Amino acid sequence: YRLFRKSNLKPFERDISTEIYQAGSTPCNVEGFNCYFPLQSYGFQPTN
Amino acid sequence: TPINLVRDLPQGFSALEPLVDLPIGINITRFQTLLAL
Structure with a gap:
């Protein structure tokens, strides 16, 4: 999922870009x- | 339109009829006409 973004996306908006955020x-x-990859992974495990 | 006129646009009236609405959305700008050669 996207954890970092310069601005909030409009409703029904898709952000596939990999823009590094400040x-x-x-x-x-x-x-x-202090600056990270926009996307963040999920730790989906059966033990979760 | 019946547009042949003589020069520039005339003093008339008519309206556009929609055809389709496709779900691109995704922050549209920069429309660019495609000129031939």
């Missing part, structure tokens, strides 16, 4: 902290 106040140009 969540952290420090601008980026680029992972780990």
Whole structure:
């Protein structure tokens, strides 16, 4: 799913892009902290 | 329209009839006419 986005998507909007976000106040140009990949995976396991 | 006129647009009236609505959505802009050669 998408955890980082520059702006909220409009209803029935699809965001497939991989735009790196500047969540952290420090601008980026680029992972780990203060700017992250927009998408985030799910830990779907039967033990969950 | 019956448009042949002489020059520029005339003083008339008529209306467009819709045909289809396809579900692209996805933030449309930058319409670009396709000119031939």
